[PDB]
Symmetry: C3
Subunit: 158 residues, 3 copies
């Protein structure tokens, strides 16, 4: 028994905020805006996992209206989600993720995001892939108004 | 033994159309524009299903020019597609879907969508997940010009 | 055992380039811009396959700045990627792909695309699905500024 999940998220890039993607703080002059730390990649990972076990989405579990979510660490949120997945009787098969951003260049941070995600999913780094693509200056990600992310996850009984 | 499918669709939001998403009519002052009822989520689910079995996309079976597509009920189209899947030997593993819309708030209608999708795929509600995200006012969805959806499906022999 | 991968890519449409998609030259008045042939779909497929086995993305294996990338045949880049996948001990389960493009109409070239991708992944055509959608004239794909593609792949031990 295998189950699939998919996640998609978008956050605005703005002046007065830290950039945290995949649990890793990137030195940058813009960061992501949200109620929590706005880590678009960990929200997308969390969404894919919840999706795979039929448990809705991060908004159902950590709504904005509740200020426990306010400035929440999304790695801790992911850990809570992974708790739900474990309770269903699953472990990670593998995950594959895409950061969609014109800038910054994510390549130097990728290996540390893979480790961090793997730690949050209680898995080996070889089960976690993270990649990045621009949109060649097209669309809202192309004009650097925001950063999007996608993930697909395969989980299995264990 | 297993196959994966992925679907993506976009419809314009316009005055004077009903809003039908996931087979559920949602009261709102705009609806989706199409030749059919323009149920962007059911079109996405149908496309993921057809994708999983190597049968093309909804346009190969129900082109815009087919008089049957005009005002077609997308749930019925989904049933037709699911008959194709079943003839190939497959049943639903699980499906995970995302509505990409700035508004309306999808949350109250999610559980009815899940039940309707599950009925179309002859499956338990536990096998179906639907979630929603905005794009934080960015891009065409952020301007409420349209609604998009994505789905990933895992099917298995049965 | 099974592994999942997901790809996404975008290239700009510009005058005075061939349009090559899914390894097929499509006669058209614009083509895709890149250092390589800029085949957005074969890039997307390659990234999905690399993702499935935890090997990063095409830029970690075939960076922009590599002279062999300049005017590269993306079918040959796919065959190399597929080499890596086989080296890790996997074969194709199935793959589902979507071209996102306002124009041209892809339908006539879809069957030749499927055969080419199946050849690239050492698979039967029945394991490969290629679809197209527009975005109803919305966003960068809808204004014909570029073409995007998505792919989800399921690979299996063999
Ligand atoms: N159109 C929408 C968009 C989001 N939602 C829900 O609201 C939450 C907040 O969405 P955003 O994070 O995109 O603002 C989501 O996690 C989802 O639970 C909704 O119910 N309808
Ligand atoms: N924001 C980004 C975008 C792309 N990249 C890298 O650059 C490579 C090529 O990306 P583009 O072709 O999208 O520009 C990617 O495969 C990825 O390795 C990155 O490291 N950070
Ligand atoms: N560029 C495109 C876009 C769509 N199509 C086909 O047209 C059909 C309908 O596309 P839209 O509803 O996205 O316009 C699709 O289901 C696909 O069969 C195509 O052949 N080439
Ligand atoms: Mg988020
Ligand atoms: Mg549609
Ligand atoms: Mg490319």
């Amino acid at each position: 028994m295998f189950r699939i999940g998919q996640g998609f998220d978008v956050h605005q890039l703005v002046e007065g905020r830290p950039l945290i993607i995949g649990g890793i703080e990137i030195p940058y002059e813009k960061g992501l805006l949200g109620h929590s730390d706005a880590d678009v990649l960990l929200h997308t990972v969390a969404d894919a996992c919840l999706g795979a076990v039929g448990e809705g989405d991060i908004g159902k579990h950590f709504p904005d209206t509740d200020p426990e979510f306010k400035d929440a660490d999304s790695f801790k949120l992911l850990q809570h989600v992974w708790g739900i997945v474990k309770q269903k009787g699953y472990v990670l098969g593998n995950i594959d993720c895409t950061i969609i951003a014109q800038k910054p260049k994510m390549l130097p941070y990728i290996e540390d995001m893979r480790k961090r995600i793997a730690e949050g999913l209680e898995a080996d780094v070889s089960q976690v892939n993270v990649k990045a693509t621009t949109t060649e200056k097209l669309g809202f990600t192309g004009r650097a108004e925001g950063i999007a992310a996608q993930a697909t996850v395969l989980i299995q009984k264990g």
